[PDB]
Amino acid sequence: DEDIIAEENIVSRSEFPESWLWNVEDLKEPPKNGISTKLMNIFLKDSITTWEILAVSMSDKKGICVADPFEVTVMQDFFIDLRLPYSVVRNEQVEIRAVLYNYRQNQELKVRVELLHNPAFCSLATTKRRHQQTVTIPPKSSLSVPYVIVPLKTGLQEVEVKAAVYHHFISDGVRKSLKVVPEGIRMNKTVAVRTLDPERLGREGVQKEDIPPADLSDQVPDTESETRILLQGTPVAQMTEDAVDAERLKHLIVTPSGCGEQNMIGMTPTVIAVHYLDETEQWEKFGLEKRQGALELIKKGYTQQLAFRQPSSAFAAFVKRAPSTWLTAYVVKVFSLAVNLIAIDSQVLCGAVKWLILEKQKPDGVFQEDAPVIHQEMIGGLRNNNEKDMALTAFVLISLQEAKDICEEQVNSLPGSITKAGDFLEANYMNLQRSYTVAIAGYALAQMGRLKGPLLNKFLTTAKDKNRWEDPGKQLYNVEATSYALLALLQLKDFDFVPPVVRWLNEQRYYGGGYGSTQATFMVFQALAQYQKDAPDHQELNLDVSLQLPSRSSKITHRIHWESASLLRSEETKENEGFTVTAEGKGQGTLSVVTMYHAKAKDQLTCNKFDLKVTIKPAPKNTMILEICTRYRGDQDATMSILDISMMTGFAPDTDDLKQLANGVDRYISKYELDKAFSDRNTLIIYLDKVSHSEDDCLAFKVHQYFNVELIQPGAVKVYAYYNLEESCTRFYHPEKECRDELCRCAEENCFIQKSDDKVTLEERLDKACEPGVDYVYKTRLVKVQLSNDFDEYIMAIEQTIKSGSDEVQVGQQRTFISPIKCREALKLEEKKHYLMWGLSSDFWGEKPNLSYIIGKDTWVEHWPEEDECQDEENQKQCQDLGAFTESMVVFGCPN
Amino acid sequence: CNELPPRRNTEILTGSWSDQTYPEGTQAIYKCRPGYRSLGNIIMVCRKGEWVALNPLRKCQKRPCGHPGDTPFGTFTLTGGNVFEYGVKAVYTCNEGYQLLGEINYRECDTDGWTNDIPICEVVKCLPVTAPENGKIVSSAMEPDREYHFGQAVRFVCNSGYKIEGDEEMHCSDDGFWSKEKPKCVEISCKSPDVINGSPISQKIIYKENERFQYKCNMGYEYSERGDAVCTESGWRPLPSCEEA
Amino acid sequence: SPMYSIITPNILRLESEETMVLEAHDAQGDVPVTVTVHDFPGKKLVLSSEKTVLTPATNHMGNVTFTIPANREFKKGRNKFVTVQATFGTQVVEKVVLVSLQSGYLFIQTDKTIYTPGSTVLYRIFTVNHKLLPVGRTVMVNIENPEGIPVKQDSLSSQNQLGVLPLSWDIPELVNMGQWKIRAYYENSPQQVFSTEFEVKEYVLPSFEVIVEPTEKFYYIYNEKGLEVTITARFLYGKKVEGTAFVIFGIQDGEQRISLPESLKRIPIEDGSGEVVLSRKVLLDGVQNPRAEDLVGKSLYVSATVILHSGSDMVQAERSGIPIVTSPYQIHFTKTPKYFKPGMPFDLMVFVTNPDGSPAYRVPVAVQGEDTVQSLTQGDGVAKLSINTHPSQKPLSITVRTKKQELSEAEQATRTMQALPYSTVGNSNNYLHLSVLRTELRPGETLNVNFLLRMDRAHEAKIRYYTYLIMNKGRLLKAGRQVREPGQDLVVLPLSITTDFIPSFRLVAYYTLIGASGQREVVADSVWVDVKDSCVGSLVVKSGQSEDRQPVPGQQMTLKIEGDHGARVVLVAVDKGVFVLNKKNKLTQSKIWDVVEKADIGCTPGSGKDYAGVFSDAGLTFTSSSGQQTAQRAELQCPQ
Ligand SMILES: *[C@@H]1O[C@H](CO)[C@@H](O[C@@H]2O[C@H](CO)[C@@H](O[C@@H]3O[C@H](CO[C@@H]4O[C@H](CO[C@@H]5O[C@H](CO)[C@@H](O)[C@H](O)[C@@H]5O)[C@@H](O)[C@H](O)[C@@H]4O)[C@@H](O)[C@H](O[C@@H]4O[C@H](CO)[C@@H](O)[C@H](O)[C@@H]4O)[C@@H]3O)[C@H](O)[C@H]2NC(C)=O)[C@H](O)[C@H]1NC(C)=O
């Protein structure tokens, strides 16, 4: 018009970030008193609000520092606030409110607010006509301009409103975006839950799992779904038997005293205790400080033992007594284990080893004792005669192998001595009768990996109850023998056999010490210590899971490891199609398939809490009566409720009627509402103290037309309790009701190909039908009509297949055609009636077994006259055209 | 008057102007040139031997273009002014570790609107890394040979009996190259330790994993704690030592 | 005669500089010292080795600083230990100390507090050491859903990032609603996980904010007036709001909420303001209990719903946690030592707070039985009460009451604590007392430390100095000597307070001698001193343009950033509307210091059952060649 900005010259505010200015700055400016100042230029966003700017600094010297929030208020004299809901349902008539603000202290502005057109939405605004309202906004006041729209397609849609003031160089606009959600209700279907365990559930080391597509029989037409494939590792702790409590070993710490034999007896407990405590790491409970005192006892025992070392490097109870083979071998056994604790002279250790080999070993590989020890109780099980050569040779051999890593470089004959000693055990092992010898000899052989076949079988079978090696006599020999067996099993890596054996040792509740306990004490703790050392931190978890989606280019593999076991790995697919899951490797995992989709809601999603009935009738330049009825759906009456009412364009409530409603009667109307003149009063709020849940609470008032327009927007009424805004009920009202509503007519434009059979010609049909786009053409009879709240289903019977494509439907079969309720009035389909239908391939819905059709904008739906009507001369033209059309398609088909 | 309405610097004529002399009170409508806005046509009129301005107050100003828009991981500056008006350019720049997709990094505010599209910034990426022989990649966000991006770090661990050779960790640097070179996994070995104030008892120099090195101390010195060393993936544990005592 | 002692923190942290104090009491000439740190118990590796010389010029006192390497040897669930060995010439003094994997701190900042499905979460991770200084290390980041299940893992390095690690996560359109977590930790120390929460919800910005403000933060149970509340409604840009308000009250016991429907009031909003009152009568009627005393311990919440006259805008606001109390104040002894020295002044650090937990300013406090012992709380809500203790082994009992004029004795806050006698070596009756002036201490001020000595005249002359050590941020910050002349009961130490002392520090002092039955004796004491919380440097954001100029949408603006030179400043702008929906988990300098204070190895305000306890409670280990040493510490955390 005149004195106003052109719509095209106005650029609406679109930048409304909830957060921005995510930038970085470096204070490199010359410091003033340690403070550097930097001027930063920024461009403010479109949002009309206060910004809170937070700043954090990092310095090499000063460190981190968080500054106080600095606020920035951004405002305009004239602006628009377009209040859009987070999301709106498709094909549901909703009302949005555009509020115009004028903060000029004392100056009224004449504004023309316009709602731009958008193919996605259906409003009074069209490509042909603009939707404009000219309103007056008083100073220090705001005006609410209602808008009724209907979303057509789902997804992030855009709404834009512009405005310009007359006689002033001022303009503004808002361009926000809202989400459009399908009519259905969000739902999740657990398709499959499979445990992944290749080694255990799979074949040849691989496990295959075929997953079915989701049912989705109730899925809302023309809505996409998404299937999640969730993979997660299953961490499994290693079941390891608890270690012997450190407090139990307080007695093991002993001060070494006596001569050549007793010095070792007292040194044994302390050495094995410090060894066990180190492995199990229990110095925390035992006493961190105490360890040093223990080592001093070990050094003390070592130093004193040297005094009994003879020139031959052998050992005996006395310096004048003949050297003992066993004693010397034992000294090597303990000393070799103590090299980790204290300083052990190689010359002493290796010297004893070389003496045992060159002086005490026979050509056959047997070690012989020429001078038994005085303390026969310190030798443990070796004391019970019988197969002494096997027992003694094994004992000495064990000592040699433990000293190998230390004395192999100094003793050239050691490797041969070990092999020759093993040769003897290997040859005479099967003859052994006593469990003790079998246990100790088995361990010696196992060290070389020479315990195989029959020998291994004998060793394992000798154990009673698969948990212990025992013999008639003192228990200490059994505990000792079983300890040797445990060490052998650990050497064999036989994890299956160990647990019962270890459990038996622990249940014996033996913690060393006492008379004749040297061997039992030393062996039991060495075996238990080794068990803890070999024990794995956790069960191995290294799965290789791969997904095979029929619609994916290549396989998707996932490497599931222990460190990332809990990590939830996901794969998403739009298509509802079966797939295969292959997993292989060690460890366990979980496979879950869930499908999110919109399922048709049989019940009403809206107005679940409030019942609302709005009626509009002509009053006895115009007047009408607006009567609103409401009832609360609950066990008790509702609390204070709000009546958000919006007038029809050009209409306003009566001041007199409002005053009468304002008067008590549990109805409150703020004075602010009462004051507004008949002009610019398109919004009204009526507060109710409470509404009945037993019956309807009805109120009514008059409305007067002040402004005259061609296209009249329908009014709206919203009821809801103060505490809950979500649970509300909105009803629209408009004259001509006791469809012409532009909003109603616009919505049904894309229901199907709109046309009159009269304008339609034979040649026209042949031209359109043969087009490659058209996939199917059927002569159908409507067998049944199943109406619903959101989508109507029409069960069509295929009487003739004029043209068939993807859907290989035979004559006599039935197909279901679907269409939104908004199109029911436009289609006007009736049972027992025939129709000529054709459409695109994109119309298909579901899969082959239950393939359905969706009546879209490109769908041709022409009523086929019955034989009764065809006899009429007026219907002759159409009946004959349809007949010739069918003949040309069936006989000749399409050109090519 | 006796001429044709003057050609303004920012306005344009709408009439054909074929006549020579024009009657009194004749309004010469001036349209607003592209990239400019106003309430209406700045209308001139002929009176008193000159073309005066019927609309003195009404004037054409530079057409305002909306916000150029911000791109993820990027910032922009304005060129040729400090307002989003016709004739200004919005130059974009990607953040550290981000590279500009394309070579057009600007948006020029033109008569209709901003020119081009909002420049896109993409995080720099480094070539995928494979597992070293006899070694594995403990770190990383899974996925075998998936191109990493700025920031991601990678660690390497060798299998039992093997020790790494080179840097243990690395990360995708700013230019899309790894901060360090990929390491190798070499079989564990140890050279014969030089014991200060002491001498080796053994003659062997090369040692494998878990092999023990024996040594004695020169007179006047004695063992610092233990009396031997063990070969490990990290070296000799403990290290040979002789303290005065 | 010579006694060689060593001092280290109770817990040694990896990849951080640790200090060790070395001394040679009653020693002569030069004393060579070598310090080594081995792993426990194997002694496989020499983690550190330092050398120093203790000459008479340094009073036979010196220190050794060592940084334990992040060896892969310290690797489940079992605590690791190291052996600190100091060799003073021939004498060898060793000690086993606990080890912490904690490398430093990680602070996570998200651009917003709440997000909508389909939006991007921009967050920064600040990597710093124990001294809050920027470092370059490998960080592990996990995005955890409401269930507690991680939906995304990543490993990044902060090297060349100046301690600032910019990250981002895209929220899928389909996502579980609720509180989402961001877990982070250094690669070297997985145990120590730093977290930050952000809510995922479907929402739209309010348009205007509503503030529910009670006249008193609390409600006195015997207040006839009842709970008075002011409802403030204003647009986000500033302009005041005109509309109608729906206000209702309720009671909360734990997580159980009881609504008070009878209190529901509809009040008009005039010029962006309105008032509503919850009468005591309605409050007592709402509950089924006649006894009003029972309500004490519970809280009240106020729900307000403001609707504009346009009917296009509606906002829900609420204030919960309004304590129903009998007293406006609350007394705490958390900052007061639980041990006293018989025959010496016992200093109490009374902590008075409001029902909400905030400090109380200028609140009179005193000890029952001693009116003379009255004091006034500082800005931090702390007051000092010094009582004179008589020589006895009887447990000391103190009851502190507020003497706030204008209040009745029934409304005065009260609390009672018990203090145990400091056990002396061989019952020698030798004690040491440290006292510090109770006033808000700031970097740049000088703090006078008082050393009060108590012991028999026969041995008093022997003491010629006090050894003091300063503990800050979990490590030794400073160590020195305080000379003393024979006969002096008190000596003052002019201690300079620098930014290093932030946010707080402990001062532990001790002396040693040979008294009685030729027994080597160690007497120690410690005090906890609080320092004004603030940034070591400074950072400010203000306008760079004339104040007359008001920001317009799409207009250019100039910001003035003044801070430390060479510092990297990261910025962010958030719409106040976002805070209306959620204001939880906002990064503040105070929250950073909170984390630092939590990590503190010290567990007590000061003192202890004995000299050994004095060191351990402060987070220190003491070990001498003669035999005196602190007990072992195997706990990473402080006792409950
Ligand atoms: C354990 O011991 C260490 C030292 O062994 C303690 O750290 C030291 O603390 C002292 C104060 O007790 C600090 O003095 C500060 O020095 C700054 C200036 O910065 C520093 O200056 C030092 C000067 O010495 C230099 O020696 C080198 C080598 O020969 C020469 O090249 C150079 O020309 C100087 O002669 C320098 O060593 C540092 O590297 C750095 O430049 C001063 O501003 C300030 O005051 C100083 O000392 C006193 C006041 O106390 C004053 O009279 C002097 O004039 C001087 O201004 C600082 O106090 C040092 O930071 C530390 N010294 C060293 C050697 O590093 C540590 O505190 C202690 N730890 C614990 C827990 O007890």
Ligand SMILES: *[C@@H]1O[C@H](CO)[C@@H](O)[C@H](O)[C@H]1NC(C)=O
């Ligand atoms: C999925 O279904 C469950 C069970 O009905 C429901 O509790 C949950 O809210 C739904 N959402 C998802 C995706 O878990």
Ligand SMILES: [Ca+2]
């Ligand atoms: Ca503080």
